[PDB]
C-alpha cells in the first residue's frame, strides 16, 4: 500500500506546490547562469579560458614532472 | 467470441486483478487539503507580483553580466 507519505500525484497537482515551485526552479536556473557568466566557474575550479590555453612563455602543452613540488609546478604553469 | 472469463479468470477466487491489487492512482488516499489554496486570491496576486519582479530582475542580470 502506502508507507506513510503524501502521494506524488497529489503533490504534483497542487496550486500551493506550483506556486512555491514557480520561483525556486527559475531562481536556481538563473543562479547557475550567473555562476557561469560572471566568471566564477573558471576561477573556482581553475579551468583555462579560451585565451589562457597558451601563454607567451610556453607554446606547448603543460607537463608536470615533480610529485612533491607539484603545487609550485602547477602554479608556474598556470601563470598568465 | 468471449468465454465469459472477463478480464481475469480467477477474479472471484483471489478477489481482484493485478490492477485491483496494486493501484498507482488512488484519489481516496489523497490529502483532503491541497485541492484548495488557503492563501486565496491575495496570495495569488502577491505571487503574480513577485514572479513579474523576479523575471525582470533575472533578465536584467542576465543581460548585464553578458557581453550585450
Amino acid at each position: 500500500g502506502a508507507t506513510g507519505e503524501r502521494p506524488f500525484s497529489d503533490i504534483l497537482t497542487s496550486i500551493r506546490y506550483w506556486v512555491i515551485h514557480s520561483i525556486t526552479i527559475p531562481s536556481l536556473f538563473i543562479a547557475g547562469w550567473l555562476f557561469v557568466s560572471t566568471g566564477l566557474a573558471y576561477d573556482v575550479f581553475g579551468s583555462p579560458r579560451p585565451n589562457e590555453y597558451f601563454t607567451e612563455d610556453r607554446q606547448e602543452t603543460p607537463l608536470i614532472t615533480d610529485r612533491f613540488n607539484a603545487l609550485e609546478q602547477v602554479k608556474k604553469l598556470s601563470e598568465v | 467470441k468471449g468465454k465469459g472469463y472477463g478480464v481475469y479468470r480467477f477474479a472471484n477466487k483471489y478477489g481482484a486483478n493485478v490492477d485491483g491489487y496494486s493501484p498507482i492512482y488512488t484519489p481516496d488516499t489523497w490529502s483532503e487539503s491541497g485541492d484548495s489554496y488557503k492563501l486565496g486570491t491575495k496570495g495569488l496576486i502577491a505571487w503574480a507580483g513577485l514572479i513579474v519582479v523576479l523575471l525582470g530582475v533575472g533578465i536584467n542580470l542576465v543581460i548585464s553580466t553578458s557581453a550585450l
Binding site: 500551493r16 512555491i20 520561483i23 531562481s27 543562479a31 560572471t38 566564477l40 | 513577485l50 530582475v57 542580470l61
Partner: peptide
C-alpha cells in the same frame, strides 16, 4: 561580491517559501 549577488538572489526565494509553508510546517512539528 559575485557570490554575494547569488546569495541576494536566493534570499527572497527562502522568504517566499517560508511565507507559504510556515503554517503546515508548524502543524507538522507539533
Amino acid at each position: 561580491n559575485r557570490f554575494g549577488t547569488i546569495a541576494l538572489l536566493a534570499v527572497p526565494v527562502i522568504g517566499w517559501v517560508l511565507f507559504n509553508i510556515l503554517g503546515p510546517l508548524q502543524n507538522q512539528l507539533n
